[PDB]
């Protein structure tokens, strides 16, 4: 699962930044390159990625390396969306946080039989900022670090 019109889009995107056809683009056009592709990367993520990508500080990247990073980023974006889609199914009162109330309702609808003590344990374990409920970032973080997706 990669595809063809999508492999060919990535190529187009790559060539925008390689008008002279030297076969590389400057690692610095990454963010603009990702945006042309529909992504919305953030500073930290770009800092992090330019650093994974240009491990030998050439300042340059080829098409295979670009293709990788973009396939990888498309898979992550799909995962995020799916995690976000589940976020919304726990937060059915749409308060934008997942509560103890939401979580208990979800366990029941799915036929679990946890105690409030276990239910609370699952909040605390997810609640990093200590506001007593679970944000999207917390929920993303919590999926990021479990069994498989």
């Amino acid at each position: 699962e990669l595809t063809e019109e999508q492999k060919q889009e990535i190529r187009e995107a790559f060539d925008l930044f390689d008008a002279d056809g030297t076969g590389t683009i400057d690692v610095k056009e990454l963010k603009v390159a990702m945006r042309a592709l529909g992504f919305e990367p953030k500073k930290e993520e770009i800092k992090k990625m330019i650093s994974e990508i240009d491990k030998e500080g050439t300042g340059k990247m080829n098409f295979g390396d670009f293709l990788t990073v973009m396939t990888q980023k498309m898979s992550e974006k799909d995962t995020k969306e799916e995690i976000l889609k589940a976020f919304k199914l726990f937060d059915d009162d749409e308060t934008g946080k997942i509560s103890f109330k939401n979580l208990k309702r979800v366990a029941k609808e799915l036929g679990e039989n946890l105690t409030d003590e276990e239910l609370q344990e699952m909040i605390d374990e997810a609640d990093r900022d200590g506001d007593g409920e679970v944000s999207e970032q917390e929920f993303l973080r919590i999926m990021k670090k479990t069994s498989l997706y």
């Binding site: 799916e82 995690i83 889609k85 589940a86 199914l89 726990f90 979580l103 979800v106 366990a107 609808e109 799915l110 679990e112 699952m122 997810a126 929920f139 919590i142 999926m143 479990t146 069994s147 997706y149």
Partner: peptide
């Protein structure tokens, strides 16, 4: 855990509609 419950809700929803 979080993931079973999330996965549960996702299946429950990809099935209904």
């Amino acid at each position: 855990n979080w993931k079973l419950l999330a996965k549960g809700l996702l299946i429950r929803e990809r099935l209904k509609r």
